Design an enzyme around this catalytic site. Structure first.
Site, PDB file in Angstrom:
ATOM      1  CG  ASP A  36      -1.799   1.222   1.325  1.00  0.00           C
ATOM      2  OD1 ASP A  36      -2.523   1.541   0.350  1.00  0.00           O
ATOM      3  OD2 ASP A  36      -1.770   1.864   2.398  1.00  0.00           O
ATOM      4  CG  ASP A  38      -1.618   8.042   0.433  1.00  0.00           C
ATOM      5  OD1 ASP A  38      -1.598   9.253   0.715  1.00  0.00           O
ATOM      6  OD2 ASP A  38      -1.503   7.613  -0.731  1.00  0.00           O
ATOM      7  CG  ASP A 215      -2.312   2.642   6.327  1.00  0.00           C
ATOM      8  OD1 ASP A 215      -2.370   2.334   5.119  1.00  0.00           O
ATOM      9  OD2 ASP A 215      -2.848   3.673   6.795  1.00  0.00           O
TER      10      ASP A 215
HETATM   11 MG   LIG Z   1      -3.010   3.210   3.377  1.00  0.00          MG
END
Ligand SMILES: [Mg+2]
Ligand SMILES: [Cl-]
Ligand SMILES: [Mg+2]
Lengths: 265, 254
Positions: A36, A38, A215
């Site tokens: 991933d 961001d 995240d």
């Molecule tokens: Mg993310």
């Protein structure tokens, strides 16, 4: 009459179903890496347009790409063009928009839901919504939409109800993807797990041990697919997760990749 | 604020918040159809009506950004005090009615022009086109002189590399002052009321608009390409008429 003979799988490492310590090193040419963007490789910023990409990020991703012989992909909620704008790594495999678009290792790009008239109708209703609610931000992402409320946390309830209602109006074609201070509306039937599984059916990823780092809630489907394939799932930051390993921060994850690279070359 | 377009292809939205949007339109090939010659264009009365309505509904944040001069645009639109960047940004009328020019009457342009007038007088077929603050050296009707045209044009630009740039084209070498392009004109408007702070829309049809697309994109806005071709624009419409239909719907939704 016909058989299904397999070659011994190139993966030389398997992780069991338990919490795991992040290894010191990995056999980079037998490992497949899915990241991933961001909040994982780069810090989350007050708005999507405000992220800061340190020069370390493209250098580390490209070195991993070299040492693994191409088996690195970004699996993001951003579009592919956005990822390209920040890494400028030509020909990097990217699944963008939570799997709604995917560029494979040949550089072929598949998209779904672009120009769908229903998305334009959803977009018009969300545009009226953020008009009535300062601090909310409507981000239009090609075939998907993101309803942000990081700068209007008191409006989480109205964001959720509006997005849930519009998705229900088109429940056969669209699905809701909650995230940190955001509700995203995206085509039904694609997700980060399916995108990882599609990469793992193609060269150079196929047969390798997968690593997935993420995240947010969307990334749990990537952890699921990495775990199902005996791989290493890494949750970045706080929160309940099905990931087998966890790191405190983007910097700490970055540091793990840097160690794997150094141990390789 | 409120509405951000990501870096991706994008569909033309059904509506936009007109009071919080800035609109920038190329003229030829974008709001009006291409013509064999510059003066043969025909401007349907739809164009000034739609532009004026958008100007009123957005509270003034509409500008034309064209390679045509301002006076020409005014002749065809007759829209009083419309913000206009003409000659690719070499002249720009702001929202207060003041016109800023870059390089007009520059002594250096006139010296370059005199050197080129000597060159073209010797070589029939070559033609020097003078465009206010910029020049164009044509060799369409003298194609065997391309190398002569290139060496002279590069040399003159080099004598004034502080302030002039060379831009090759089809059977032509353009000599333009520095800091003159549509992207810089858009950027200048976005630093001024009432455009400042608003999500920009920029529509265009050819390569001179690509820098305008890039500026709209950098500000999280909507770039719209008219017609086919590779572009940095995020959205696309089929034609001049199709683009007008979008403006019409945006107005009617307002
Ligand atoms: Mg993310
Ligand atoms: Cl997902
Ligand atoms: Mg044009």
């Amino acid at each position: 009459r016909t058989f299904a003979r397999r070659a011994r799988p190139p993966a030389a490492i398997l992780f069991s179903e338990s919490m795991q310590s992040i290894p010191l090193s990995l056999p980079l040419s037998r490992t497949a890496f899915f990241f991933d963007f961001d909040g994982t490789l780069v810090d989350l910023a007050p708005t999507p347009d405000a992220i800061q990409v340190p020069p370390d990020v493209p250098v580390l991703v490209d070195a991993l790409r070299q040492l693994s012989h191409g088996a690195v992909a970004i699996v993001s909620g951003r579009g592919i063009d956005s990822i390209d704008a920040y890494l400028n790594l030509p020909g990097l495999p990217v699944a963008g928009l939570h799997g709604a678009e995917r560029r494979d290792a040949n550089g072929d790009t598949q998209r779904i839901g672009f120009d769908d008239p229903r998305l334009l109708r959803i977009e018009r209703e969300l545009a009226a919504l953020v008009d009535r609610h300062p601090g909310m931000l409507l981000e239009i992402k090609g075939a998907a939409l993101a309803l942000h409320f990081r700068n209007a946390p008191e409006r989480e309830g109205v964001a959720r109800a509006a997005a849930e209602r519009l998705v229900a109006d088109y429940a056969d074609a669209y699905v809701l993807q909650p995230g940190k201070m955001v509700f995203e509306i995206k085509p039904k039937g694609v997700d980060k797990g399916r995108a990882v599984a599609a990469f793992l059916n193609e060269p150079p990823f196929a047969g390798r041990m997968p690593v997935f780092a993420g995240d947010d809630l969307t990334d749990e489907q990537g952890f699921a697919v990495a775990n199902a394939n005996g791989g290493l799932s890494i949750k970045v930051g706080a929160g309940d997760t099905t990931a087998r390993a966890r790191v405190d921060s983007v910097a700490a994850l970055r540091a793990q990749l840097a160690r794997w690279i150094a141990a390789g070359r």
